[PDB]
mmCIF file of C-alpha atoms in Angstrom:
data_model
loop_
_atom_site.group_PDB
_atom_site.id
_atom_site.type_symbol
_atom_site.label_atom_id
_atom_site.label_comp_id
_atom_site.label_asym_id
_atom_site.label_seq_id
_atom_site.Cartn_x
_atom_site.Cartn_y
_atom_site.Cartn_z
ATOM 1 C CA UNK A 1 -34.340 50.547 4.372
ATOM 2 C CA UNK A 2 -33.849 47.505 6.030
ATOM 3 C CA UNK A 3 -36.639 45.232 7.498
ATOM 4 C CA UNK A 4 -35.705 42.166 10.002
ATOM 5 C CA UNK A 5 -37.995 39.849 11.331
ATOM 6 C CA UNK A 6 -36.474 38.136 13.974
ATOM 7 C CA UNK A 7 -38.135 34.754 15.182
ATOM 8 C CA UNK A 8 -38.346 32.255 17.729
ATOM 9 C CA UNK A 9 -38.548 28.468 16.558
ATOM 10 C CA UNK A 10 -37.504 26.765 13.381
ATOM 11 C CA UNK A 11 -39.433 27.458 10.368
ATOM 12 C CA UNK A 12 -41.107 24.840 8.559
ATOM 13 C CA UNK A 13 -39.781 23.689 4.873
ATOM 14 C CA UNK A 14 -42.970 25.639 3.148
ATOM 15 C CA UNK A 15 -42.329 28.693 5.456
ATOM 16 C CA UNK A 16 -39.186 28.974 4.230
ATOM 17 C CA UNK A 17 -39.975 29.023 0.655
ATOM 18 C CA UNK A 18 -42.737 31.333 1.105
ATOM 19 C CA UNK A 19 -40.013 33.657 3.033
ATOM 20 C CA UNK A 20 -38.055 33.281 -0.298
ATOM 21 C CA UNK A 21 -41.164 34.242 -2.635
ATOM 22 C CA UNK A 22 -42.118 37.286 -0.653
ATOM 23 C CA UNK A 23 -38.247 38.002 -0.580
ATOM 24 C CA UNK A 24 -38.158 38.357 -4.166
ATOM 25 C CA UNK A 25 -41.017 41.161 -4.369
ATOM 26 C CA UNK A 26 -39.981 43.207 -1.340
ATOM 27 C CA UNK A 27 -36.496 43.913 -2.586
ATOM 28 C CA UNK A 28 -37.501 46.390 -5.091
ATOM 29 C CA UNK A 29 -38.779 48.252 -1.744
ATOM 30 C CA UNK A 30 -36.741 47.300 1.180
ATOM 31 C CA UNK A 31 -34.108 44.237 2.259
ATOM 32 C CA UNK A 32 -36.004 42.070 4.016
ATOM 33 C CA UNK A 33 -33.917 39.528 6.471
ATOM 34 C CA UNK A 34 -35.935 36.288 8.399
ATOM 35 C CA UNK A 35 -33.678 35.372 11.511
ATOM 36 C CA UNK A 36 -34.554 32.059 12.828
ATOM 37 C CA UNK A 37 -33.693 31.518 16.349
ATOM 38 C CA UNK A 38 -33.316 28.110 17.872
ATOM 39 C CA UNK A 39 -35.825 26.710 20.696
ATOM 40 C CA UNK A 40 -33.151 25.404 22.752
ATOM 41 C CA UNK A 41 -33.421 26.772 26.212
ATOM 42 C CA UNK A 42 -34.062 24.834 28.892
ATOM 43 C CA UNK A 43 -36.002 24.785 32.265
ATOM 44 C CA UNK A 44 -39.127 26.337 33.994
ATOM 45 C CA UNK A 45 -41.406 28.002 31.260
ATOM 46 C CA UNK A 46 -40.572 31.530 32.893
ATOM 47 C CA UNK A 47 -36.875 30.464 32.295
ATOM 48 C CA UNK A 48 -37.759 29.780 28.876
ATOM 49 C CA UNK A 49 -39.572 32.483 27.679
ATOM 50 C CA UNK A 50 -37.335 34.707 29.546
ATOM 51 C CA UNK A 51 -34.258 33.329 27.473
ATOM 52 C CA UNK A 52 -36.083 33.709 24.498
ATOM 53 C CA UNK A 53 -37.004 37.156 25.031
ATOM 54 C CA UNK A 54 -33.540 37.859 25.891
ATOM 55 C CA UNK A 55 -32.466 36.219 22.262
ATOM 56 C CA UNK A 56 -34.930 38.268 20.421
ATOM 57 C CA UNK A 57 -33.891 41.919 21.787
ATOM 58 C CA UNK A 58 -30.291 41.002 21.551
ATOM 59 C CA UNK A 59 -30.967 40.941 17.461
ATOM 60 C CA UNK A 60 -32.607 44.472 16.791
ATOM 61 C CA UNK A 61 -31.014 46.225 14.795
ATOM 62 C CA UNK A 62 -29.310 49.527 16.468
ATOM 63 C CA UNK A 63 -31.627 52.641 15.723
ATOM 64 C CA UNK A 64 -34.496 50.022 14.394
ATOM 65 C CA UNK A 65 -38.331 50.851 14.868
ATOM 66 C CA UNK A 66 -39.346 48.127 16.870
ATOM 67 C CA UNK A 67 -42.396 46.053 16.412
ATOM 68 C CA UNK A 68 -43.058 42.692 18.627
ATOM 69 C CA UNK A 69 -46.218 40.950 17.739
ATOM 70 C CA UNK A 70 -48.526 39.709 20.407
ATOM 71 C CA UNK A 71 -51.921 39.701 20.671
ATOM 72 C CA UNK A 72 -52.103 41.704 23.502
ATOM 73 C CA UNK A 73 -50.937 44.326 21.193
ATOM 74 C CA UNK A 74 -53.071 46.807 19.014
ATOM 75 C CA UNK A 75 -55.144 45.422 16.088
ATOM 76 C CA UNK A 76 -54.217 46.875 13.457
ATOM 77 C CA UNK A 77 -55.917 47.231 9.509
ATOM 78 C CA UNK A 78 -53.580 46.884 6.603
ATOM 79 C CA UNK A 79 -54.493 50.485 5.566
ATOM 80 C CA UNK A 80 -53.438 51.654 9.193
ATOM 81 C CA UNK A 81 -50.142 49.313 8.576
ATOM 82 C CA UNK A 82 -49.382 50.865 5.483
ATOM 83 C CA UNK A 83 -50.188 54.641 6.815
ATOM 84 C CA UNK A 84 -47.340 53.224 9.666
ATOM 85 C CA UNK A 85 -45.240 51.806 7.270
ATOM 86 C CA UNK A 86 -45.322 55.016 4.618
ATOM 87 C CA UNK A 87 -43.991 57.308 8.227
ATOM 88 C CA UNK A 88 -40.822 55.261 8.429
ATOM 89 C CA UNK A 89 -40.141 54.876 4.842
ATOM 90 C CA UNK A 90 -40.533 58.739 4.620
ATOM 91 C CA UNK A 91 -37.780 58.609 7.865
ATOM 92 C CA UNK A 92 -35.533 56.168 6.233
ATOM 93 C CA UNK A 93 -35.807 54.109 9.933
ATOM 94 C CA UNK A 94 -34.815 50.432 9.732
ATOM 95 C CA UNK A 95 -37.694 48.107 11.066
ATOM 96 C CA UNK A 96 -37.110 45.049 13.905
ATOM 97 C CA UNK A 97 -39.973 42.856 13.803
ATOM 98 C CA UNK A 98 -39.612 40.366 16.688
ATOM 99 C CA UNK A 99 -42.050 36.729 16.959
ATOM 100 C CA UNK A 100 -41.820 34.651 20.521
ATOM 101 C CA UNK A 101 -42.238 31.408 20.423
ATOM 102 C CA UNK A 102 -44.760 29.081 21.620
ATOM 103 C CA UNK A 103 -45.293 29.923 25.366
ATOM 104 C CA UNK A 104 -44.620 33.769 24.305
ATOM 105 C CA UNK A 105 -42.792 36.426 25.576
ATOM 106 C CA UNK A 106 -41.158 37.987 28.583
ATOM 107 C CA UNK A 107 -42.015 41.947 29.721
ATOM 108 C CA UNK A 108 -38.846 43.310 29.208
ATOM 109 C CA UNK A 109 -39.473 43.233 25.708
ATOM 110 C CA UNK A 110 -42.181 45.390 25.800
ATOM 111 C CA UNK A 111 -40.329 48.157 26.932
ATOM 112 C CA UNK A 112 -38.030 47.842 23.580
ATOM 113 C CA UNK A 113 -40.828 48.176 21.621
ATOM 114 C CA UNK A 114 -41.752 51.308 19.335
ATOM 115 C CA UNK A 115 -45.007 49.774 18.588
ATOM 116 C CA UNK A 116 -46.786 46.036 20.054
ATOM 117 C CA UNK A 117 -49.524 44.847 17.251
ATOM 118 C CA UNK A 118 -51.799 41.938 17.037
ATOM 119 C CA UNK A 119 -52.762 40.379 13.654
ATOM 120 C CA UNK A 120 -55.708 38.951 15.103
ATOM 121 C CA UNK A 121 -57.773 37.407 18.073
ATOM 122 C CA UNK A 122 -56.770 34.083 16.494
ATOM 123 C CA UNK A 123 -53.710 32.990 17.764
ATOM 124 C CA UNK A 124 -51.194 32.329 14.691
ATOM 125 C CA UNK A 125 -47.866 29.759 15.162
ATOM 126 C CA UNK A 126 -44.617 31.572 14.662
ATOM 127 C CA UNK A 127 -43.823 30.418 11.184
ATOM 128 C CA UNK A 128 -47.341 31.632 10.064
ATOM 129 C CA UNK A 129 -47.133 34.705 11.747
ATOM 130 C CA UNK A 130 -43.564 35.556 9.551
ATOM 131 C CA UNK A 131 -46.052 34.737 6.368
ATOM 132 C CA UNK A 132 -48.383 37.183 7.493
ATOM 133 C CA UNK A 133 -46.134 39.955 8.183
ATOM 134 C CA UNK A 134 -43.429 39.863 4.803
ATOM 135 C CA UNK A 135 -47.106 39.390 2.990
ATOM 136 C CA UNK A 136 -48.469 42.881 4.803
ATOM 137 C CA UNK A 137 -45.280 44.577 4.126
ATOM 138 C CA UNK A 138 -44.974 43.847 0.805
ATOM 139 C CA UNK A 139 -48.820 44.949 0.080
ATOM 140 C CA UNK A 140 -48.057 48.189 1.915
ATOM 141 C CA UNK A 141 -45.226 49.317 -0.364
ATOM 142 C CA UNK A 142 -47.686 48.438 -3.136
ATOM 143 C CA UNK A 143 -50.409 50.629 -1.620
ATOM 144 C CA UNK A 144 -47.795 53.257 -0.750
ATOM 145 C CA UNK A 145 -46.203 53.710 -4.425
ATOM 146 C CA UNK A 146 -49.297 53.698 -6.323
ATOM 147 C CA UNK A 147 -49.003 49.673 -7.469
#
């Protein structure tokens, strides 16, 4: 079962070792992989975001359930996650997790998307949002199996 989380921006030096600590839980469950995908497109903001849209679907993984996080997206509880979470382990489907960057994300990603969730009416930066997410996963497979 494999579980990417692809992301826009470079991650900051704690982000990356708290990418590492949930790492070394979730791979009991799952293997977990952070993509970190450089902010360096240039141009109008719709040019941006475009680009970076573009950079984020061209990295899910073939036959992947894909979830992009926006808060446009549903809200979602971390019992509901896990409920979603337990359906795909039981299908052996791969996850794509995909993050925007600052000025967010194009449309056409939407239309990639298995599922669109929001982890809150606060808005989160894209390193904290990858924290959130491993941190959610990893308490789902505990909730799941018992633990």
């Amino acid at each position: 079962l494999r579980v990417r989380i692809a992301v826009i921006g470079k991650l900051d030096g704690f982000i990356k070792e708290g990418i590492k600590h949930y790492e070394k839980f979730l791979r009991r469950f799952c293997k977990p992989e952070v993509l970190e995908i450089k902010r360096v497109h240039r141009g109008s903001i719709e040019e941006i975001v475009r680009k970076e849209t573009e950079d984020l679907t061209n990295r899910i993984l073939p036959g992947s359930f894909v979830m992009v996080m926006d808060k446009r997206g549903e809200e979602v509880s971390s019992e509901e996650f896990a409920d979603f979470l337990k359906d795909l382990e039981m299908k052996g489907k791969d996850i794509t997790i995909l993050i925007g960057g600052p000025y967010g994300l194009n449309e056409e990603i939407f239309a990639k998307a298995h599922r669109v969730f929001s982890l809150s009416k606060m808005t989160f930066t894209h390193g904290m949002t990858v924290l959130i997410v491993l941190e959610q996963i990893f308490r789902a497979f505990k909730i799941i199996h018992g633990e």
